[PDB]
Design a protein around this ligand. Structure first.
Ligand code: ATP
Ligand code: ADP
Ligand code: MG
Ligand code: MG
Lengths: 35, 551, 548
């Protein structure tokens, strides 16, 4: 499925510092685990 | 209580709405990416980059607008707090020290407006993102969204119950900071005296006690932070677990998308939950400034009487007074005397008999607690503030001199900058020109704080020049008789007793010495707050033999 | 710069036990967060595929257990970071205040006290408020980025291509932005101090302002200062937003270029579709982590590099001689000048004293008279070691005045100021000011000696009655009497009465004339006129800095 994400990867950094990405949900810590 | 924090913000209400529409547009543009490019595994790269660039530009514009609006709000609030502070009665500043007042004005406002700036945009952003996520989840599954929204209000109970504690804790922290600032200012302002008596370590220890009192509360703050961070995360995970259980009972293949959206809605809720304690802390911190902003002063409002011509007819009708902090003790007992233009009235008495209190009452600093005081047939509050303080001038027993150029100290408080000839005339009249012309920078010479650079009698001469530049109608002299030099004394006696401008003025000479009271038209003896004897020099001396100066 | 942070770490060293605990937990926190996605994906696929209640429950139970483990450590770490922030702030403030008192008296004429207080209030908070979020994010990104770089094993010869074309672009922009950000922060601080000085002046001398009715003038001045600060605030925010925009654009461009290159690699290189998206995740993560780390490090540097004047005040060495040691058990009281000439250090090359050679001895009252600005008060100050003479020397008991111990010299030699200042507190704590121990039996004798008991008894709580700031709750004569009692209670050997009788009435003027009643004190009296000192054993006349 890999549903897209509309929230920052880290929740403790202000959204002004969001640093827009291309992969969205594929960039979070969940994909750091990956396997 | 929270309504004040929104009332102080609701001045603009337009820039914030524009920022909100900009962030909504940015959120829509970010949400629109997959349906045009394709959901996964993607000529197609250009439009995606274009959308990302547009989102970045919109975010930049919104951030700039929000920052400018927040700066405007901060400046307005910080100015208005001080403007409200200056309106209080002169009694209020005996209860609150200057080192506490300026700490409240400068630090509390800059913390409240920083917290508001840091939290408002975050709250709006996560609110709109959570709304978009909920709108998607509604298409995902209606019933499960309903049960999630039903169980959502339960999580607010514990923060609501622990809400007040943050306010009462922050109030204590802020008051301890203000008390520490008071000690710091009191130690720094009087450094020569502290050095002379070698009490430096005493001041350090006294500051350290307040620092320790702050350190005691900071630990409880940290512990509350930690426990709140535990509880918010526990509730956030419980929210998703209690609906994963419902999905398991329900099993239906489309549940995967709805769960992947719920795991993001729950993080939005988790952030909004951590928003609340900071709102409570901000409400608690601003307790004193939102009391200053609306505390009604005890003084009567100023009138609007501005006669173009006035005569210094000052008379007292059974005036009695008592200082506010000790109202049970009457400082003055039924004084009654009259001043007239062209006459000089000398007030003479022992130390602590109430002479300076009479001077303060004449300057409308305090209101009488008995009888009535009238100026030209009108009570003092009926006059306009600026007009009253122009027509009545005084020299204090220890005149304050501000840290600016001597031409601005002499011309202090005037509605317009006088021409240099007027300042020269006043300085020559008061005798200050004997030493002003000797300074390397002349009238432009800078003055250190409280007049520390000036000598003894020079301060009295500058104060007299400052009083005379207004051409007052009633003149008060508390100590400009003793410290003056030989030339300034002759100038003072010339202006008091032989200058042509005498007949337009009435003078209240306050002095316990015989320096200039011999030539006064009336001598009033004030003992224990009550007038004992009155009359001219010969009339006063005849009834008591050697009345004073026995040796 | 990094030099100041080294001093910041030097003073932060006592808090290391909190820092190691914070590092310990955050490591546990991240090692807990790295396990949640496994069970989340497991429950997701089990719900989607062939359903099974039993494997569902175990997966969600382990997810809950790891969520407890991570959340406890995260909150339990944030708490200690928040506490160590406040500890650092309090230590910085305490050391700054302890260092300000050590300065020479010349420093306090060059600088306004309101600005000093505003700096002590604001700059320490600016120095220490970033810790609970900047350090956490920096450390977390630093630990997480190493793992994604270690996954270079996916495709080895291309992450070096990342490293060699990603750094120079980012580093230069950070330097260029930081050079201006630090300057604008420093200007904001030096403007906010100037703004606070206005409130200090307006509230401190408010009685004069109300007497002259200039409240609105002060309000306008403060509003002007606030506008000056607001302009700097807006400039800083706008430049920060511009930097954020350029950073986002650069990151997007480099990612697009590397996506194109990765596609160009798959035609003949050792790459496949499965590996390519596998590699892209790690590259994106490492880019985001490094671009956050650089920004956080730069912001942390300039926050410290903004409040430099606090460090300048903290380590400033005063223009004073080395502390004295001498403290004999008996002091004769003989003081004498030897060709003493003095010029004030703040405005030198303007001699106030040309040359003085007077001597004093015990039991012989000496009167010093002169016109306004003659130099009597500066002689009194030189006697008290407040200023050092530029020529000659001041000898007390055949020893230089600077060689006596501070606590002993200021206990043996006391003076009464021309206009005394009294600190807030009880009357007994003003009379006994500066003494470690003093019984009420001594304070009540001092009050009798200064003719003060006749009005102390009438106060609200007797001798325990509070006195307002600067003595603003007493008459001028009462302040003078309390100042006299303060000097008398210290049983001094050398007493300097710098125009002490100016504010008293004739009864007290004549009653306290006999200061030499005990006959074992060196008394110096300073008088504006010769008449009040006709009884003085020795009379010195001073004009233009020269004695007759
Ligand atoms: N703010 C105050 N609150 C309470 N009592 C006060 C206050 N200011 C002055 N007093 C008291 O009121 C009395 C009158 O004081 P005041 O300053 O008028 O004396 P004075 O006659 O001008 O003195 P002097 O000639 O020594 O300057 C004194 O007993 C004094 O202690
Ligand atoms: N803190 C200071 N810094 C620089 N110059 C000073 C300072 N205090 C006084 N002066 C100057 O030095 C001279 C010393 O005179 P002073 O001893 O104060 O006269 P008096 O004995 O009447 O008080 C004064 O004319 C004054 O202008
Ligand atoms: Mg008085
Ligand atoms: Mg003097």
């Amino acid at each position: 499925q890999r549903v897209r994400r509309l929230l920052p990867c880290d929740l403790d950094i202000h959204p002004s510092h969001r640093l827009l990405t291309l992969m969205n949900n594929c960039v979070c810590d969940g994909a750091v685990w990956n396997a | 209580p929270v309504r004040r924090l929104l009332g102080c913000l609701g001045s603009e209400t337009r820039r914030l709405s524009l920022f909100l529409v900009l962030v909504v547009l940015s959120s829509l543009g970010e949400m629109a990416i997959p349906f045009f490019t394709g959901r996964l595994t993607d000529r197609n790269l250009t439009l995606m980059s274009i959308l990302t660039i547009a989102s970045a530009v919109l975010e930049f514009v919104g951030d700039g607008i929000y920052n400018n609006t927040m700066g405007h709000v901060h400046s307005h609030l910080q100015g208005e707090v001080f403007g409200a502070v200056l309106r209080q009665e002169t009694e209020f500043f005996q209860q609150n020290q200057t080192g506490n007042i300026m700490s409240r004005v400068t630090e509390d406002t800059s913390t409240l407006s920083d917290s508001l700036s840091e939290n408002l945009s975050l709250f709006l952003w996560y609110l709109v993102r959570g709304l978009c996520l909920l709108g998607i989840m509604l298409w995902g599954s209606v019933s499960l969204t309903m049960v999630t929204l039903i169980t959502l209000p339960l999580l607010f109970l514990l923060p609501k119950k622990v809400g007040k504690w943050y306010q009462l804790l922050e109030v204590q922290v802020r008051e301890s900071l203000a008390k520490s600032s008071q000690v710091a200012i009191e130690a720094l302002s009087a450094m020569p005296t502290v050095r002379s008596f070698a009490n430096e370590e005493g001041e350090a220890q006294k500051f350290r006690e307040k620092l320790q009192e702050i350190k005691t509360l900071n630990q409880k703050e940290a512990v509350a932070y930690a426990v709140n961070s535990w509880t918010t995360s526990i509730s956030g995970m419980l929210l998703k677990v209690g609906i994963l259980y419902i999905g398991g009972q329900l099993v239906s293949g489309n549940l995967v998308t709805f769960v992947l959206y719920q795991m993001q809605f729950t993080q939005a809720v988790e952030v909004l939950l951590s928003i609340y304690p900071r709102v409570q802390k901000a409400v608690g911190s601003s307790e004193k400034i939102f009391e200053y902003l609306d505390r009604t002063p005890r003084c009567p409002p100023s009138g609007l009487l501005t006669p173009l011509h006035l005569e210094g007819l000052v008379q007292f009708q059974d005036v009695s007074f008592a200082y506010p902090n000790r109202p049970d003790v009457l400082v003055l007992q039924g004084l009654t005397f009259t001043l007239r233009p062209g006459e000089v009235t000398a007030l003479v008495g022992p130390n602590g008999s109430g002479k300076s209190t009479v001077a303060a009452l004449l300057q409308n600093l305090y209101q009488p607690t008995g009888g009535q005081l009238l100026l030209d047939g009108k009570p003092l509050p009926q006059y306009e503030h600026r007009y009253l303080h122009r027509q009545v001038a005084a020299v204090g027993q220890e005149p304050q001199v501000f840290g600016r150029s001597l031409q601005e100290n002499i011309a202090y408080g005037l509605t317009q900058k006088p021409t240099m000839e007027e300042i020269t005339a006043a300085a020559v009249k008061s005798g200050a020109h004997s030493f002003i012309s000797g300074l390397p920078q002349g009238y432009d010479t800078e003055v250190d704080e409280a007049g520390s650079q000036l000598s003894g009698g020079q301060r009295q001469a500058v104060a007299l020049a400052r009083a005379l530049i207004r051409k007052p109608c009633v003149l008060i002299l508390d100590d400009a008789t003793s410290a003056l030099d030989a030339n300034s004394q002759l100038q003072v006696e010339q202006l008091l007793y032989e200058s042509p401008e005498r007949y337009s003025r009435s003078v209240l000479l306050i002095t316990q010495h015989l320096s200039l009271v011999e030539q006064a038209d009336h001598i009033l003896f004030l003992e224990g707050g009550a007038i004992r004897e009155g009359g001219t020099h010969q009339q006063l001396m005849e009834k008591k033999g050697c009345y004073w100066a026995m040796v | 710069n990094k030099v100041l942070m080294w001093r910041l770490l030097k003073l932060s060293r006592p808090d290391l036990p909190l820092l190691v605990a914070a590092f310990f937990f955050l490591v546990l926190a991240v090692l807990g967060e790295t396990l949640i996605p496994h069970y989340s994906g497991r429950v997701i696929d089990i719900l989607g595929g062939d359903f099974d209640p039993h494997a569902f429950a175990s997966a969600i139970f382990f997810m809950c257990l790891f969520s407890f483990g991570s959340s406890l450590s995260a909150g339990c770490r944030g708490g200690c970071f928040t506490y160590t922030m406040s500890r650092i702030n309090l230590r910085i403030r305490e050391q700054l205040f302890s260092s300000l008192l050590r300065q020479d008296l010349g420093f306090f004429q060059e600088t306004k006290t309101g600005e000093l207080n505003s700096r002590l209030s604001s700059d320490t908070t600016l120095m220490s408020n970033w810790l609970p979020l900047n350090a956490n994010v920096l450390l977390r990104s630093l630990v997480k980025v190493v793992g994604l770089y270690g996954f270079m094993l996916s495709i080895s010869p291309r992450l070096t291509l990342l490293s060699l074309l990603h750094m120079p672009f980012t580093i230069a922009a950070e330097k260029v932005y930081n050079t201006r950000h630090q300057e604008v922060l420093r200007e904001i601080q030096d403007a906010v101090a100037r703004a606070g000085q206005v409130v200090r002046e307006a509230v401190g001398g408010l009685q004069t302002v109300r007497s002259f009715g200039a409240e609105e003038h002060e309000v306008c001045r403060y509003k002007e200062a606030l506008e000056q600060c607001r302009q700097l605030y807006w400039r800083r925010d706008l430049e920060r937003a511009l930097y954020l925009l350029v950073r986002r654009v650069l990151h997007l461009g480099v990612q697009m270029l590397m996506l194109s290159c990765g596609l160009q690699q798959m035609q003949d290189g050792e790459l496949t579709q499965g590996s390519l998206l596998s590699f892209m995740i790690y590259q994106e993560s490492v880019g985001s982590y490094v671009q956050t780390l650089v920004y956080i490090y730069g912001d942390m540097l300039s926050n410290v590099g903004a409040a430099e004047k606090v460090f300048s005040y903290m380590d400033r060495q005063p223009n004073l001689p080395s502390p004295g040691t001498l403290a004999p058990t008996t002091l004769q009281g003989v003081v004498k000048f030897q060709d003493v000439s003095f010029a004030y250090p703040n405005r030198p090359d303007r001699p106030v004293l040309k040359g003085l050679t007077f001597t004093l001895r015990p039991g012989e009252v000496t009167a010093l008279v002169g016109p306004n600005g003659s130099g009597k008060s500066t002689v009194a100050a030189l006697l008290q070691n407040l200023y050092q003479p530029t020529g000659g020397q001041v000898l007390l008991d055949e020893k230089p005045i600077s060689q006596y111990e501070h606590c002993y010299l200021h206990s043996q030699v006391v003076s009464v100021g021309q206009e005394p200042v009294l600190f807030s507190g009880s009357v007994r704590n003003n009379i006994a000011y500066g003494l470690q121990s003093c019984e009420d039996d001594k304070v009540m004798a001092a009050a009798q000696a200064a003719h003060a008991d006749d009005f102390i008894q009438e106060m609200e709580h007797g001798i325990y009655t509070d006195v307002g700031e600067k003595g603003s709750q007493l008459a001028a004569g009462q302040k003078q009497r309390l100042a006299i009692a303060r000097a008398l209670v210290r049983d001094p050997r050398v007493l300097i009465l710098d125009e002490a009788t100016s504010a008293l009435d004739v009864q007290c003027e004549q009653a306290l004339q006999d200061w030499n009643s005990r006959g074992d004190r060196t008394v110096l009296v300073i008088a504006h006129r010769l008449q009040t000192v006709q009884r003085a054993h020795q009379i010195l006349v001073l004009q233009e800095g020269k004695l007759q």
